[PDB]
From a paper:
Clathrin-mediated endocytosis (CME) is a vital multistep process in all eukaryotes in which plasma membrane cargo proteins are first concentrated into a patch by clathrin adaptors, which are themselves clustered by interaction with a polymeric clathrin scaffold. The most abundant clathrin adaptor is the 300-kDa heterotetrameric adaptor protein 2 ([name]) complex, consisting of α, β2, μ2, and σ2 subunits. Here, we used cryo–electron microscopy, tomography, and subtomogram averaging to determine structures, interactions, and arrangements of clathrin and [name] at the key steps of coat assembly, from [name] in solution to membrane-assembled clathrin-coated vesicles (CCVs).
We assembled both [name] and clathrin onto YxxΦ cargo/PtdIns(4,5)P2-containing membranes. Inclusion of an additional “dileucine” [ED]xxxL[LI]-containing cargo resulted in tilting of α, and movement of β2 away from σ2 to further expose its [ED]xxxL[LI]-binding site. Helices 2 and 5 in σ2 are poorly resolved, and the proposed β2 N-terminal PdIns(4,5)P2-binding site now contacts the membrane as does a region in the vicinity of helices 2 and 3 of μ2. In vesicles and buds with both [ED]xxxL[LI] and YxxΦ cargoes, the dimeric form of [name] is absent, likely because the N-terminal helix of β2 has moved to contact the membrane and can no longer contribute to dimerization interface. The transitions from cytosolic to single-cargo membrane-bound [name], and from single- to double-cargo membrane-bound [name], involve conformational flexing of the α and β2 solenoids. The [name] distribution was unchanged by the addition of clathrin and, hence, by the formation of buds and vesicles. We did not observe a regular packing arrangement of [name] in our assembled vesicles, excluding the possibility that clathrin organizes [name] into a lattice, and also excluding [name] oligomerization as an essential step in membrane curvature generation.
Numbering used by the authors:
A (entry chain A): 9 to 621
B (entry chain M): 1 to 135, 142 to 223, 236 to 446
C (entry chain B): 4 to 582
D (entry chain S): 1 to 142
Write the structure that this text describes.
């Protein structure tokens, strides 16, 4: 019905050398601009053609800086296609020039006054996407007067529902409520699910705002939902897709009710129990159908129902059913199946009820993640075992987890080693063996671990008071290891500085040798390490006098006298002016066993949690 | 020694995937692409380290080239190899682009794997490569190739025949000059190379003379023969060579031996940072009038032999950005202005030596000269000139064919002396 | 050769269809699609049956493409390699030594355990070979064999054979032998390569003189491993280096300078060829920076390294560092940097003119660097320090924090070198605390506090303010505050008691660093003990550091000499630091 | 909710960009390029829902077409996958074995029907017979 548009699509589709595209663009530019910049615009064909061109070009990587008052002219233009392309344009091209917006909102109120479906629908569509505050200003209660106060049909009503849900999720401030419970909950009793879906959505929003507002919901909702489960697909056949019963609306209802507390009722939630048995006893069957979509919907609503049951775990038998189901579920050849199963399980993983029942599947998890070649699944499994971990399993868990981690990514490496270390401390009673575990960890990398981690283990040590001789001796062992890991250096150096006496009746215990050794390492590190080693060195003498004279000689070297910084200057200063010049009593006086650290809460957990997204 | 060596386009996909190590991973390569090939920031380096892994990835053109290694090497030889690679790619097929790579794929691959095997880089002497490396051996050919490999002679030497034996030289002297805008030569240096185009038979070693330790002293000896204490000749500030020379022979007796290949090539490049000849006496300077006007004074005294004729004389005289009132001066040539670069183009059709064309400029402004201020863009003279600025020239030239027939006299020689002064810039 | 770059969507079965044509054309084009697949990284191992049955042929290009495909995909499928070894044998019985060497390199490009014995004596006959390419590829695939399993008496006998092949006349074979063994030295029994000896040194030197740049550089790095027993042989060696000027230089030059500095430790009075080289070295160094931006860039790295190691005659060639517009930002940076390092007391006037010029240019980064450098010049000769005062002051008055930010630390260090001189600016600084965003600059201000809290009397209110920051700030900031407060209480005990007590309680109970907590420990058990004694240590002066200005760790430098030419040195980060 | 809805051809370029928030040229373009690269490198054993460094997209690959719909963390992927499958059915049903050239002349039709059954970042409708009915009866609206 208009040449320019179609012929332009034709030609520029056939144009390939971007310069030819540009040429055709400029030809249409002359055409349309001059037709609007002069050559006054004509109503149906010309406007529609040129404006659809303008819109799609705006989409093609351009923009229209005109014709928007004339796009109002499209809204005020006979053909529905003109009004519609205006609808879209202003909905697609975010507007300016509030007088434009003024005419827009006026025309919107007219398209409402025009109580025909299409006008109001498209108007709500532009209201949602353009989303100017003035809409929800003029339509704070007006869109209510649309969706209620007059209740006729579905399509336009869920249109208004999604519009107002946008305006509410974006501007609930422009929403005064009072009370409208009865209407929407009767909609929940409406069998015309066209509204009821978007209804339950927005109602779920408001219940996130006000669950308490809707207990009247609960009874009617659970009745209707038990019905949905029991009345699957025999009628409302276009409410029926692949003969599933209202999957989206049912999931809406279940997740809504999931905000509400666990089961407490005997009979209403007895009927709930009935639905639970229904759901599980129906999911168990193999499909008479042969299309995955049915499986998809069934497993989706399965996740929804189970999650609704999840976090309650007051249902031992149901927990058993879930454990069995999950056990079967980590066998489904598509990685995504067992993957989402892993999510659902690690979700449920914290079941004090079924902890052991899950732990049964530990080797399943083990070989799976070993024979996995993916990580997502593996982190789900890590969280799963994590929620359920304990000393007994942890013993081996260390070995297998580490054997996996040595080959992994890098950040996740940090998060995992940190979370497994805090697991260990959750179970650390074999503090000597735990120290050994930490030694192994450091031996793996010991050069990427953050501060609070080894900070914590040092605190543990000074708070442990049991293996400190063992600890010191083993630290020494790690020290004669030829390689270097600066974290090991810091930690074990300080430890022996305070605990080297606890390993002293040995030839390797020879603060002369290890002293000069650390000296070879002394000036090849980061700065804070040097402060640590300065504290350690000043510990040395007052805990090991034999090496003193040598230590004296060495701490006078120009290096520490010329260390560029202010701090290490002063640190070496307060050390030297007290070693060189020594009252010899203030040494021991100051020196102190650095008592076990006062109680804390291991904020490593909250730190990992903030790292947790 | 090295692994993957991958050539890349702009869209980032490989143009080649030429691996030479096991360690190389696809997970590595695509990461390299998405992270270097694609990066929000745009300041990088031809070498790159990502997780203790080196990455000499270069765009030697619109086309890119990625050298991946995790082995500590000499980066310099890596780059030398990259050069030699793209350079021989050009030498064999000129332009290097999509089709240039495609329709050469197989040769590309066999060469790369040869010239560098598992990262161990082999030579690229191409003494007879392109012959059998052509975009099926005989016993004589088998032994022939084996020997030419074992033969310690390259640059296409097997004993050739040319119906004549002639060489045309061209001494290019690039004027590396900066002078103070008030007049003082801040930079007086020259960058020149001996490019040698030859058409001769056989495989002759040649020698050559170019005046040393003193200012300069078959059919045409020389039209500008080296008068005693002649043109500027100095101990070469830096003389660079190419693998035909014998620097052992030099540092023994200050003379290499070069067996040149045939055709065109660069025999030896050289630099001298002293003792040059000035073609003009220009004092290009700007002054400022409070802050409403910037005025530029450009007195371009040209200084060569008036017999010498420089043509298409285009001098770059930037006009002040803010322009309210112009003040133009004309002496000789053509008045041309440059907008979008804000410049007086005192474009002169031609200039003889020892000349002077003055243009004085005032351009009214608005104050913007602040703690951050106007950038003074060096006024430069750009033009055409062939020249022997140092005039350090052929002290002699010893060529022959001491194998069968054609002697020195049986060779006809040439040279050009093309000065090059686009580096004539000063305003600040 | 033309591009194919297509593999998907059942066209694998079209690939079959053309493979269901033995005729050369469909075969070659199908092959080109296979190469497309291999480039785009899509496995075509399924064709190994097709590849092997069509592989019965005699075409050289077909042989080569089969070599590549077979190799790189049996990499992904060791199973069907049974097919390969047969052909590889057939080729080792193909009198073409070049085709044989191609077989050898494709083969030795894979090592598991079986092709090993299949080639061993054939490999030894490639060692007992007379063709440069056959023996060459033999050495290369012996190196490649060392990828794994390089511990066997068989590979050891091969090592003996090639180890005698170290003595080799063939330039190619001896050259890759040198390269190979030098790489094998990276296998670390730390007893590698016992073939070094004076006559060997001389013969390989001659070779270098006559062998390609490859073998030359290999010889150079090997010499970088051999340790002469005195300078006389080293004298003769540097004479051998005398002709090692302009070549395929960059690599050769860097490695040569490495080997020389390895012997360049004696005095230029011991030999003047020493100081002859010292003086002669500058113009080639300029060429290094007169080369190509990347190689001049490497050269700048190496030059900073040298100036660090050897502060000498280059002290008059700062000209090379003379920045220009066209110069790229970082090159300009290092230019200016070594310019400062090549402090020209003559030029410092016009140098600083240029410097403020740069300050008046349009990039934050180089501006901050130049501010630091000017501050160093203030730490340098005092005269400059006055123009530094004026300039850095007006730069403060530019009121762009980041400049002033690092400038705070700059002046902190200057005043550390030069205290109680221009305290007048501390007043101005007092306003400038409402922009503290650099732990460096903040620590500089707190350092000022600790310095002059006796002169600073308004210290009280500003400090009780600064008590807003106790947490969420990096420990050094804490420690700086703590020592400043310690200094203060020493110089002004009259009103620091409440301060020291609250801050000690906090920093010791809110502590996580045991050094911080026990430092609070020491702080009280010195100040509760004897401030009367504390002052003598603390309140007495702490001598300066005497012009570090970005010094270098010698040993690190000394060991990176073993890398000057290699990535480690040029990168100025330890070779160990990257693996 | 539905962050946006992107559809690209086997020829690269996103042949339908459909959004639900105020994404921007830089943002939309990054989305396009990154998602496209992912789709390319993503081989066949994959899902229809890939997380991109902070949340997911419900993507749907086809020999020529790649229907990518963005959601975040919680939405039950399966339901939306079936919804997308349904919508594809509807399209080629009405578009009668659509070739891309059809939408090149009728992209707006696809767009407005999307707007019809999907709204505000959510499904506005899902009713196959009714969808086709209302479409056709309103595929006659001038």
């Amino acid at each position: 019905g208009m040449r320019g548009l179609a012929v332009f699509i034709s030609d520029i589709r056939n144009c390939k050398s971007k310069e030819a595209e540009i040429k055709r663009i400029n030809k249409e530019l002359a055409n349309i601009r001059s037709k609007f910049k002069g050559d006054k615009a004509l109503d149906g064909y010309s406007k529609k053609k040129y404006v659809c061109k303008l819109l799609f070009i705006f989409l093609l990587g351009h923009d229209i800086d005109f014709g928007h008052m004339e796009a109002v002219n499209l809204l005020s233009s006979n053909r529905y296609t003109e009004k519609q392309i205006g609808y879209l344009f202003i909905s697609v091209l975010v507007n300016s020039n509030s007088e434009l917006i003024r005419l827009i909102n006026n025309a919107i109120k007219n398209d409402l006054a025009s109580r025909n479906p299409t006008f109001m629908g498209l108007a709500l569509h532009c209201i949602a996407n353009v989303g100017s505050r003035e809409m929800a200003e003029a339509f704070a209660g007006e869109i209510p007067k649309i969706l209620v106060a007059g209740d006729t049909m579905d399509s336009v009503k869920q249109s208004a529902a999604l519009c107002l849900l946008r305006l509410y999720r974006t501007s609930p401030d422009l929403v005064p409520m009072g009370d409208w419970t009865s209407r929407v909950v009767h909609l929940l009793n409406d069998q015309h699910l066209g509204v009821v879906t978007a209804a339950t959505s927005l109602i779920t929003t408001l219940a996130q705002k006000n669950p308490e507002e809707f207990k009247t919901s609960v009874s009617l909702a659970v009745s209707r939902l038990s019905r949905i489960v029991t009345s699957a697909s025999t009628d409302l056949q276009d409410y029926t897709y692949y003969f599933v019963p209202a999957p989206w609306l049912s999931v809406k209802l279940l997740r809504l009710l999931q905000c509400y507390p666990p089961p407490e009722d005997p009979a209403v939630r007895g009927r709930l129990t009935e639905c639970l048995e229904t759901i599980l006893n129906k999911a168990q069957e193999p499909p008479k159908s042969k299309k995955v979509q049915h499986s998809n919907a069934k497993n989706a609503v399965l996740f929804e129902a189970i999650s609704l049951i999840i976090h309650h775990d007051s249902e031992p038998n149901l927990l058993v059913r879930a454990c069995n189901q999950l056990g079967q579920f980590l066998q489904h050849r598509e990685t995504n199946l067992r993957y989402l199963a892993l999510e659902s399980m690690c979700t449920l993983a914290s079941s004090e009820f079924s902890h052991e029942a899950v732990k049964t599947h530990i080797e399943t998890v083990i070989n799976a993640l070993k024979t996995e070649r993916d990580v997502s699944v593996r982190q789900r499994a890590v969280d799963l075992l994590y929620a359920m971990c304990d000393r007994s399993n942890a013993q081996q868990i260390v070995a297998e987890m580490l054997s996996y981690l040595e080959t992994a990514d890098y950040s996740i490496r940090e998060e995992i080693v940190l979370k497994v270390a805090i697991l260990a401390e959750k179970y650390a009673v074999d503090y000597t063996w735990y120290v050994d575990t930490i030694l192994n960890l450091i031996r793996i990398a010991g050069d990427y671990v953050s501060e609070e981690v080894w900070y914590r283990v040092i605190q543990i040590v000074i708070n442990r008071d049991d293996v400190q001789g063992y600890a010191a001796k083993t630290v020494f062992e790690a020290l004669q290891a030829p390689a270097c890991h600066e974290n090991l250096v810091k930690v074990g150096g300080y430890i022996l500085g305070e605990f080297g006496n606890l390993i002293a009746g040995d030839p390797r215990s020879s603060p002369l040798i290890q002293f000069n050794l650390l000296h070879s390492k002394f000036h090849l590190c980061s700065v804070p390490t040097r402060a640590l080693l300065l504290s350690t060195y000043i510990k040395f003498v007052n805990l090991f006098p034999e090496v003193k004279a040598t230590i004296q000689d060495v701490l006078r070297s120009d290096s520490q006298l010329k260390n560029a910084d202010v701090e290490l200057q002063q640190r070496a200063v307060e050390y030297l002016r007290l070693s060189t010049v020594a009252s010899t009593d203030i040494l021991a006086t100051v020196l102190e066993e650095m008592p076990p650290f006062p109680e804390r809460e291991s904020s490593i957990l909250a730190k990992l949690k903030k790292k947790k997204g | 020694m090295i692994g993957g060596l991958f050539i890349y386009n702009h869209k980032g996909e490989v143009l080649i995937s030429r691996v030479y190590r096991d360690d190389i991973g696809r997970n590595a390569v695509d990461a390299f692409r998405v992270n270097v090939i694609h990066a929000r920031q745009q300041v990088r380096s031809p070498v790159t380290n990502i997780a203790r892994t080196s990455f000499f990835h270069v765009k030697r053109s619109n086309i890119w080239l990625a050298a991946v290694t995790k082995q500590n090497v000499n980066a310099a030889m890596v780059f030398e190899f990259l050069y030699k690679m793209c350079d021989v790619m050009a030498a064999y097929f000129g332009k290097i682009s999509e089709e240039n790579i495609k329709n050469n794929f197989v040769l590309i691959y066999e060469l790369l794997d040869e010239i560098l095997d598992f990262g161990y880089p082999q030579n690229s002497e191409t003494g007879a490569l392109k012959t059998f490396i052509t975009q099926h051996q005989t016993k004589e050919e088998q032994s022939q190739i084996t020997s030419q490999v074992t033969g310690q002679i390259g640059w296409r030497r097997e004993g050739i025949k040319y119906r004549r034996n002639e060489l045309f030289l061209d001494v290019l002297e690039s004027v590396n000059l900066l002078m103070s805008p008030q007049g003082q030569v801040l930079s007086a240096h020259v960058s020149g190379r001996v490019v040698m185009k030859s058409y001769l038979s056989g495989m002759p070693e040649c020698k050559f003379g170019m005046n040393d330790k003193i200012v300069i002293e078959s059919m045409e000896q020389k039209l500008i023969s080296e008068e005693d204490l002649g043109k500027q000749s100095i101990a070469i500030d830096d003389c660079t060579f190419h693998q035909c020379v014998r620097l052992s022979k030099f540092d023994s007796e200050r003379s290499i031996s070069f067996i040149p290949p045939d055709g065109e090539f660069e025999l030896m490049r050289y630099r001298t940072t002293k003792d040059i000849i000035l073609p003009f006496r220009v004092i290009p300077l700007v002054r400022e009038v409070g802050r409403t006007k910037l005025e530029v004074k450009v007195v371009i005294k040209s200084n060569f032999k008036p017999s010498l004729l420089a043509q298409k004389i285009e001098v770059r005289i930037p006009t002040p950005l803010n322009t309210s009132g112009v003040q133009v001066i004309c002496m000789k040539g053509k008045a041309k202005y440059k907008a979008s670069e804000n410049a007086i183009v005192w474009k002169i059709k031609r200039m003889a030596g020892m000349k002077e064309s003055q243009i004085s400029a005032e351009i009214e402004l608005l104050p913007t000269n602040d703690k951050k201020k106007w950038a003074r863009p060096p006024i430069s003279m750009n033009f055409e000139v062939p020249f022997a600025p140092s005039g350090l020239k052929v002290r002699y030239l010893k060529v022959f064919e001491p194998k069968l027939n054609y002697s020195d006299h049986d060779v006809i020689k040439w040279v050009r002396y093309i000065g090059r002064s686009g580096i004539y810039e000063t305003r600040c | 050769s033309k591009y194919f770059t297509t593999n998907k969507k059942g066209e694998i079965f079209e690939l079959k269809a053309e493979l269901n044509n033995e005729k050369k054309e469909k075969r070659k084009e199908a092959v080109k699609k296979v190469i497309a697949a291999m480039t785009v990284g899509k496995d075509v191992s399924s064709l190994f049956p097709d590849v092997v049955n069509c592989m019965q042929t005699d075409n050289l290009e077909l042989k080569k493409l089969v070599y590549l495909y077979l190799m790189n995909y049996a990499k992904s499928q060791p199973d069907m390699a049974i097919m390969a070894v047969n052909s590889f044998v057939k080729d080792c019985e193909d009198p073409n030594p070049l085709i044989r060497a191609l077989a050898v390199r494709t083969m030795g490009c894979i090592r598991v355990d079986k092709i090993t014995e299949y080639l061993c004596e054939p490999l030894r006959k490639c060692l007992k070979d007379e063709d440069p390419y056959v023996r060459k590829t033999a050495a290369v695939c012996v190196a490649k064999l060392h990828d794994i399993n390089a511990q066997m008496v068989e590979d050891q006998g091969f090592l003996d054979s090639l180890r005698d092949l170290i003595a080799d006349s063939n330039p190619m074979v001896v050259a890759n032998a040198v390269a190979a063994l030098s790489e094998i030295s990276e296998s670390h029994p730390n007893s590698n390569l016992l073939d070094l000896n004076p006559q060997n040194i001389n013969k390989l030197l001659t070779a270098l003189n006559e062998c390609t740049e490859w073998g030359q550089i290999f010889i150079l790095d090997c010499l970088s491993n051999y340790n002469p027993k005195d300078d006389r042989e080293a004298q003769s060696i540097c004479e051998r280096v005398t002709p090692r000027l302009s070549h395929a230089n960059s690599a050769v030059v860097l490695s040569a300078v490495k080997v020389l500095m390895k012997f360049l430790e004696l005095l230029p009075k011991d030999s003047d060829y020493y100081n002859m080289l010292l003086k002669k070295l500058a113009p080639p160094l300029v060429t290094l920076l007169s080369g190509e931006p990347e190689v001049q860039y490497v050269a700048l790295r190496n030059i900073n390294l040298i100036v660090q190691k050897r502060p000498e005659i280059l002290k008059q060639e700062i000209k090379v560092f003379f920045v220009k517009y066209n110069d790229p930002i970082y090159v300009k940076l290092e230019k200016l940097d070594i310019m400062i390092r090549l402090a020209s007391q003559a030029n410092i006037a016009q140098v600083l003119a240029e410097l403020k010029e740069y300050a008046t240019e349009v990039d934050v980064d180089f501006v901050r660097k130049a501010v630091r450098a000017i501050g160093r010049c203030a730490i340098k000769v005092e005269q400059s320090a006055e123009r530094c005062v004026s300039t850095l002051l007006d730069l403060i008055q530019t009121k762009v924090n980041y400049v002033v930010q690092e400038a705070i630390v700059v002046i902190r260090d200057i005043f550390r070198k030069y205290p109680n001189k221009y305290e007048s600016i501390i007043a101005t600084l007092c306003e400038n605390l409402d922009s503290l965003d650099e732990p460096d600059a903040r620590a500089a201000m707190i350092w000022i506090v600790g310095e002059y809290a006796e002169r600073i009397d308004n210290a009280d209110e500003l400090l009780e303010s600064f008590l807003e920051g106790f947490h969420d700030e990096s420990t050094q900031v804490q420690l700086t505050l703590l020592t400043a407060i310690v200094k203060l209480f020493l110089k002004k005990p009259s009103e620091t008691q409440e301060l020291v007590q609250q801050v000690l309680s906090l920093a010791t109970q809110d502590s996580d660093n045991p050094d911080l907590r026990d430092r609070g420990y020491i702080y009280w058990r010195l100040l509760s003990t004897d401030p009367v004694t504390a002052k003598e240590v603390v309140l007495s002066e702490k001598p300066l550091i005497s012009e570090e200005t970005d010094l270098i760790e010698p040993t690190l430098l000394d060991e990176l000499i073993c890398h000057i030419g290699s990535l480690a040195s040029v990168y100025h980060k330890p070779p160990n630091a990257f693996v | 909710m539905i962050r946006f809805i992107l559809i690209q051809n086997r020829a690269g370029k996103t042949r339908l960009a459909k959004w639900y928030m105020q994404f921007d040229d830089d943002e939309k373009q990054k989305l396009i390029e990154e998602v496209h690269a992912v789709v390319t490198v993503r081989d066949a054993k994959h899902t229809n829902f890939v997380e991109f460094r902070n949340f997911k997209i419900i993507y749907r690959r086809y020999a020529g077409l790649y229907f990518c719909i963005c959601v975040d963390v919680n939405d039950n992927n399966l339901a939306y996958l079936e919804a997308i499958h349904n919508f594809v059915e509807v399209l080629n049903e009405y578009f009668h074995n659509v070739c891309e050239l059809d939408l090149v002349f009728n992209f707006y039709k696809v767009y407005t029907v999307v707007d019809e059954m999907f709204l505000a970042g959510e499904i506005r409708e899902t009713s196959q017979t009714k969808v086709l009915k209302q479409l056709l009866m309103l595929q006659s609206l001038e």
